Write an enzyme that holds these catalytic residues in place. Structure first.
Site, PDB file in Angstrom:
ATOM      1  N   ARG A 284      86.754  64.665  15.032  1.00  0.00           N
ATOM      2  CA  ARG A 284      85.781  65.223  15.614  1.00  0.00           C
ATOM      3  C   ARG A 284      84.827  65.815  13.787  1.00  0.00           C
ATOM      4  O   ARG A 284      84.126  66.151  14.516  1.00  0.00           O
ATOM      5  CB  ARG A 284      86.609  66.718  15.176  1.00  0.00           C
ATOM      6  CG  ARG A 284      87.663  67.289  14.094  1.00  0.00           C
ATOM      7  CD  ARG A 284      87.933  68.276  14.630  1.00  0.00           C
ATOM      8  NE  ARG A 284      88.581  68.842  12.784  1.00  0.00           N
ATOM      9  CZ  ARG A 284      89.953  68.528  12.786  1.00  0.00           C
ATOM     10  NH1 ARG A 284      90.988  67.310  13.530  1.00  0.00           N
ATOM     11  NH2 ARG A 284      90.678  69.336  11.229  1.00  0.00           N
ATOM     12  N   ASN A 285      84.811  65.435  12.546  1.00  0.00           N
ATOM     13  CA  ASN A 285      83.951  66.027  11.466  1.00  0.00           C
ATOM     14  C   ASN A 285      83.303  64.450  11.144  1.00  0.00           C
ATOM     15  O   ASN A 285      83.013  64.163   9.782  1.00  0.00           O
ATOM     16  CB  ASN A 285      85.081  65.988  10.389  1.00  0.00           C
ATOM     17  CG  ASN A 285      84.824  67.800  10.310  1.00  0.00           C
ATOM     18  OD1 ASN A 285      84.356  68.812  11.004  1.00  0.00           O
ATOM     19  ND2 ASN A 285      86.077  67.964   9.451  1.00  0.00           N
TER      20      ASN A 285
ATOM     21  N   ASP B  72      80.967  68.744   7.602  1.00  0.00           N
ATOM     22  CA  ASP B  72      81.822  68.976   6.956  1.00  0.00           C
ATOM     23  C   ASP B  72      82.648  68.993   5.350  1.00  0.00           C
ATOM     24  O   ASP B  72      83.112  69.992   4.893  1.00  0.00           O
ATOM     25  CB  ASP B  72      82.577  69.686   7.946  1.00  0.00           C
ATOM     26  CG  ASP B  72      83.078  70.865   8.192  1.00  0.00           C
ATOM     27  OD1 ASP B  72      82.933  71.722   8.539  1.00  0.00           O
ATOM     28  OD2 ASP B  72      84.967  71.695   7.649  1.00  0.00           O
TER      29      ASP B  72
ATOM     30  N   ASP C 231      88.968  67.678   4.685  1.00  0.00           N
ATOM     31  CA  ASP C 231      88.913  67.418   5.915  1.00  0.00           C
ATOM     32  C   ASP C 231      87.896  66.466   6.560  1.00  0.00           C
ATOM     33  O   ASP C 231      88.001  66.550   7.633  1.00  0.00           O
ATOM     34  CB  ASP C 231      88.552  68.484   6.298  1.00  0.00           C
ATOM     35  CG  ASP C 231      89.202  69.079   7.453  1.00  0.00           C
ATOM     36  OD1 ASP C 231      89.407  68.766   8.545  1.00  0.00           O
ATOM     37  OD2 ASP C 231      88.131  70.157   8.083  1.00  0.00           O
TER      38      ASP C 231
HETATM   39  C1  LIG Z   1      83.861  67.088  17.765  1.00  0.00           C
HETATM   40  C2  LIG Z   1      82.775  68.320  18.481  1.00  0.00           C
HETATM   41  C3  LIG Z   1      81.509  68.786  17.951  1.00  0.00           C
HETATM   42  O1  LIG Z   1      81.251  67.968  16.573  1.00  0.00           O
HETATM   43  N1  LIG Z   1      80.705  68.995  19.640  1.00  0.00           N
HETATM   44  C4  LIG Z   1      79.118  68.927  18.881  1.00  0.00           C
HETATM   45  C5  LIG Z   1      78.340  68.019  18.120  1.00  0.00           C
HETATM   46  C6  LIG Z   1      77.195  67.733  18.386  1.00  0.00           C
HETATM   47  N2  LIG Z   1      76.283  67.604  17.094  1.00  0.00           N
HETATM   48  C7  LIG Z   1      76.104  68.609  15.732  1.00  0.00           C
HETATM   49  N3  LIG Z   1      75.356  67.712  14.557  1.00  0.00           N
HETATM   50  C8  LIG Z   1      75.175  68.794  13.623  1.00  0.00           C
HETATM   51  C9  LIG Z   1      76.313  69.559  13.491  1.00  0.00           C
HETATM   52  C10 LIG Z   1      76.264  70.428  12.342  1.00  0.00           C
HETATM   53  O2  LIG Z   1      76.275  69.589  10.504  1.00  0.00           O
HETATM   54  O3  LIG Z   1      77.403  71.120  11.148  1.00  0.00           O
HETATM   55  C11 LIG Z   1      76.550  72.065  10.423  1.00  0.00           C
HETATM   56  C12 LIG Z   1      78.434  72.175   9.400  1.00  0.00           C
HETATM   57  C13 LIG Z   1      75.713  72.797  10.167  1.00  0.00           C
HETATM   58  C14 LIG Z   1      77.566  69.753  14.400  1.00  0.00           C
HETATM   59  C15 LIG Z   1      79.005  70.352  13.819  1.00  0.00           C
HETATM   60  C16 LIG Z   1      79.588  70.943  12.367  1.00  0.00           C
HETATM   61  N4  LIG Z   1      80.845  70.919  13.429  1.00  0.00           N
HETATM   62  C17 LIG Z   1      82.023  71.184  11.343  1.00  0.00           C
HETATM   63  C18 LIG Z   1      81.118  71.484  14.015  1.00  0.00           C
HETATM   64  C19 LIG Z   1      81.740  72.128  15.258  1.00  0.00           C
HETATM   65  C20 LIG Z   1      81.590  72.732  15.977  1.00  0.00           C
HETATM   66  C21 LIG Z   1      80.356  71.556  16.537  1.00  0.00           C
HETATM   67  C22 LIG Z   1      80.030  71.176  16.100  1.00  0.00           C
HETATM   68  C23 LIG Z   1      79.885  71.383  14.600  1.00  0.00           C
HETATM   69  N5  LIG Z   1      77.748  69.281  14.855  1.00  0.00           N
HETATM   70  C24 LIG Z   1      76.359  68.410  19.042  1.00  0.00           C
HETATM   71  O4  LIG Z   1      74.542  68.286  19.612  1.00  0.00           O
HETATM   72  C25 LIG Z   1      74.646  68.139  20.438  1.00  0.00           C
HETATM   73  C26 LIG Z   1      77.479  68.829  20.639  1.00  0.00           C
HETATM   74  C27 LIG Z   1      78.732  69.071  20.243  1.00  0.00           C
HETATM   75  N6  LIG Z   1      79.874  69.372  21.560  1.00  0.00           N
HETATM   76  C28 LIG Z   1      78.753  70.048  22.451  1.00  0.00           C
HETATM   77  C29 LIG Z   1      79.466  67.952  21.861  1.00  0.00           C
HETATM   78  C30 LIG Z   1      78.110  66.990  23.368  1.00  0.00           C
HETATM   79  N7  LIG Z   1      79.075  66.812  24.297  1.00  0.00           N
HETATM   80  C31 LIG Z   1      78.300  66.742  25.234  1.00  0.00           C
HETATM   81  C32 LIG Z   1      80.210  66.609  24.324  1.00  0.00           C
END
Ligand SMILES: *CCC(=O)Nc1cc(Nc2ncc(C(=O)OC(C)C)c(-c3cn(C)c4ccccc34)n2)c(OC)cc1N(C)CCN(C)C
Length: 266
Positions: A137-138, A151, A133
């Site tokens: 996005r990952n 992921d 995957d």
């Molecule tokens: C591409 C979408 C996205 O990732 N958005 C995102 C991500 C993050 N940071 C973050 N940190 C750690 C992890 C993680 O390791 O999760 C594991 C599975 C516990 C993730 C993350 C991993 N997956 C599979 C996700 C799916 C959806 C959302 C997050 C994860 N992500 C942050 O940290 C602030 C914010 C964020 N969004 C809110 C976007 C930030 N905007 C400012 C655009």
């Protein structure tokens, strides 16, 4: 190695904010407060749907991943549901990053990301692990110069538009099918976050691939870079580049970044 994976009590971590939601579950931004430490570690928390039937065995594998470009499973909370604790990447995912910073991203950033992603995938291949995957996005941004593949291990909603043709048709997943997904991920980065095959239904993707159609050349890409992506999407999986070679190719290009990517104001 049992100690690499911490078993957490529910009292040890708190969920503060939602970062994303889907059919898989929900990812929360939270705080991890181990009992006798008096520290607050920013973490991401993914709560999986209830099992209705092993994933601890996969959790130990995810806890043993030891590479600066692959996210490691920090801990797990085992109840009726299963919650996975990992380090919070404060800059979000690379897909959102290139979209929000579409104006001011240089060729050196982009080629360095390609190297780091290939390094993480090459590490997984050396461990005989298949990601299944890989997408923009990952890929998460710890700092703008340090990205990590996340992921890994969730495989054990089909991402058709990132899958190798043999994965779509035969459900064959190998390291070479990861290389195909790597090519699409790089295409996502070079177009600053465009959606691959935009408008085409997922049910028609295998057809256009069988007819020879591929993602178009991104405007900032010289043919040298695009032919690397094109080789990741060859039908013969063994003909595709290996992550070992991709590291070397993109490393050489990162040394003279302006020669290989044409970016406004670079
Ligand atoms: C591409 C979408 C996205 O990732 N958005 C995102 C991500 C993050 N940071 C973050 N940190 C750690 C992890 C993680 O390791 O999760 C594991 C599975 C516990 C993730 C993350 C991993 N997956 C599979 C996700 C799916 C959806 C959302 C997050 C994860 N992500 C942050 O940290 C602030 C914010 C964020 N969004 C809110 C976007 C930030 N905007 C400012 C655009």
């Amino acid at each position: 190695n049992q100690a690499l994976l911490r078993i957490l009590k529910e009292t040890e971590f708190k969920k503060i904010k939602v970062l994303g939601s889907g059919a898989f579950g929900t990812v929360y931004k939270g705080l991890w407060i181990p009992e006798g430490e008096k520290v607050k570690i920013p973490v991401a928390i993914k709560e999986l749907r209830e099992a209705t039937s092993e994933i601890l065995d996969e959790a130990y594998v995810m806890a043993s991943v030891d590479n600066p470009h692959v996210c490691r499973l920090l801990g797990i909370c085992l109840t009726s549901t299963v919650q996975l604790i990992m380090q919070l990447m404060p800059f979000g995912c690379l897909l959102d990053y290139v979209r929000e910073h579409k104006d001011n991203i240089g060729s050196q950033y982009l080629l360095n990301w390609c190297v780091q992603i290939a390094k993480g995938m090459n590490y997984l291949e050396d461990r005989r692990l298949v990601h299944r995957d890989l997408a923009a996005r990952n890929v998460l941004v710890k700092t703008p110069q340090h990205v990590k593949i996340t992921d890994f291990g969730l495989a054990k909603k089909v991402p058709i538009k990132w899958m190798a043709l043999e994965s779509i048709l035969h459900r064959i997943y190998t390291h070479q099918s990861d290389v195909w997904s790597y090519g699409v991920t790089v295409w996502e980065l070079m177009t600053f976050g465009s959606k691959p095959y935009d408008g085409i239904p997922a049910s028609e993707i295998s057809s256009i691939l069988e007819k020879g159609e591929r993602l178009p050349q991104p405007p900032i890409c010289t043919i040298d870079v695009y032919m690397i992506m094109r080789k990741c999407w060859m039908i013969d999986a063994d003909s595709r580049p290996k992550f070992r070679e991709l590291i070397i190719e993109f490393s050489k290009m990162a040394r003279d970044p302006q020669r290989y990517l044409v970016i406004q104001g670079d």
